[PDB]
Ligand binder design. Structure first.
Ligand SMILES: O=C(O)c1cccnc1C(=O)O
Ligand SMILES: O=C(O)c1cccnc1C(=O)O
Ligand SMILES: [Cl-]
Ligand SMILES: [Cl-]
Ligand SMILES: [Cl-]
Ligand SMILES: [Cl-]
Ligand SMILES: [Cl-]
Lengths: 297, 296
């Protein structure tokens, strides 16, 4: 029940590397989903308007914590600044069961209004970071990194990319316009993979550029053309080993990125083929939520 | 574009989709993808006058949901300049290779829409698919499955829609349409039955569900004859006892179990004799359904 939050909160967000205008759109929208049918009828009947309590946000499962500054923004907006923090962990920290991510004090009615919006953000972004961190682990021992994609949930892209970073992964492009990625359907609608790569290089030479191949024949063209980065689409582990052979023999300056048909179990096998990157949509479209709850004193 | 045709405006209403809320989701999701430029890749590689047929089909089996929303994305991007050859209905079960939609539009407009349409399709169909799986496990009992308020930010109404299409039932939609006395109300309010009596006091027509964590609390609210009790994190065995104590007391209180539920133990919880299972995983942990969009 406020306009926007205090610039003290805006500083907290940009310090963590969160887009503050996007965080505001997400937070305001999520509060409205809960409040559009009227005030918190349950709290209004059972909790005095004057009550103040302490609240602890803690995890029940282990994983990586993301979104604590955005959760704090929710609470700033609902209380209008009238809260005091005692303890907090930082986004990126590992959490075990019972670990305290936040201990804050505010008016009881406003915590009760904010908590579900705080926790839905927190449990979701933490799930993303927790899963990204799992994928990074399957790649320990190699030189392979994990990246996300554009397969993000409507409305939560920048926040899901942020959570991916907090879990130790790397972002891909953020949209259709900040980098070139030539896909199957571009090659369906057009000539060949090679023609397409030459067309994007010529048309937009500033932007970084990646081409997605579905066969070894296509891989041969883009290697002949000296492609900067190549994405292997639904290659088997053997096919990737071949693709790494053909890459190492031509331009060792070509990054190979595997995508499609990847699961956490086979992540280790792929990393071992010598490909440089795994692009995993599951990071942001099928990230199971981390169990965090908010308990009162 | 600005808004969409009144035809998609009414196809959404025919589905029971909040059309205003859909507009916000769809326009936000498109702005996410275009706020950086114009789709350099397609503008370099696809003729500006190309027109293609596109098929949406699923690679895995599940329940389809969100197709009217995916269509509204296509409408906005094309300005209504598209045509549908075939479409399945939200709620239909699909298998591998099953075609949920065949559209024809300008190839460049399809490529800008492709990812927003699929992100909506795959998430909502995922929500409906998991909900349907939960329904199967409850089959042969009188237990139904219900969602929660543990929804992804900005997506509550579309996800509740998808729970309905997967064969589940919606719980309340916000903080103001139903009473639900939670663990923290009880802390701040001294006692579980103290809080329930306070709720009946303030609005006697609004029905109260009270959320208990101990068998003791359950006797307390069953003694006050609570209309509906939610068993927070009872074990399968504690639910069986909960049902026993409820059948003893001459009130037919409704029993809904919630807290930690996984598909895993879904079929077991359905046979404790509780009436409802409230599953946050339907919406906060629904794995996406693999649908793709392919050109002719
Ligand atoms: O298009 C992208 O940005 C992308 C990048 C890597 C992996 N997948 C995708 C996708 O969403 O198709
Ligand atoms: O508050 C709700 O609507 C709700 C309903 C059923 C199960 N859980 C919840 C929750 O507290 O998130
Ligand atoms: Cl960063
Ligand atoms: Cl292994
Ligand atoms: Cl309905
Ligand atoms: Cl007891
Ligand atoms: Cl009652």
């Amino acid at each position: 029940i406020a306009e926007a939050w205090s610039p003290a909160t805006d500083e907290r967000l940009r310090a963590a590397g969160i887009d503050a205008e996007d965080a505001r759109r997400v937070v305001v929208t999520a509060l409205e989903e809960d409040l559009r049918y009227g005030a918190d009828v349950t709290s209004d009947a059972t909790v005095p308007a004057d009550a103040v309590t302490e609240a602890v946000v803690a995890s029940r499962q282990p994983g990586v914590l993301a979104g604590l500054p955005v959760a704090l923004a929710v609470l700033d907006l609902v209380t209008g600044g009238r809260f005091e923090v005692a303890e907090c962990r930082a986004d990126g920290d590992r959490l075990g069961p019972g670990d305290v991510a936040l201990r804050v004090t505010a008016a009881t009615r406003e915590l009760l209004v904010a908590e579900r919006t705080m926790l839905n953000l927190l449990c979701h972004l933490s799930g993303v970071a927790t899963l990204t961190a799992r994928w990074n682990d399957a790649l320990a021992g190699t030189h392979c990194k994990v990246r996300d994609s554009r397969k993000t949930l409507p409305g939560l892209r920048l926040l899901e990319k942020y959570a991916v970073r907090r879990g130790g992964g790397q972002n891909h492009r953020l949209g259709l316009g900040d980098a070139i990625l030539i896909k199957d359907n571009h090659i369906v609608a057009g000539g060949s993979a090679g023609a397409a790569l030459q067309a994007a290089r010529a048309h937009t030479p500033g932007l970084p550029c990646e081409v997605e191949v579905t066969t070894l024949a296509e891989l041969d063209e883009v290697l002949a053309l000296g492609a900067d980065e190549v994405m292997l689409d639904n290659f088997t582990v053997e096919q990737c080993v071949e693709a790494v052979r053909r890459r190492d023999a031509a331009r060792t300056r070509t990054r190979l990125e595997a995508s499609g048909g990847l699961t956490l179990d086979v992540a280790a096998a792929y990393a071992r083929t010598g490909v440089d990157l795994l692009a995993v949509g599951a990071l942001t479209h099928s990230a199971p939520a981390l169990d965090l709850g908010l308990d009162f004193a």
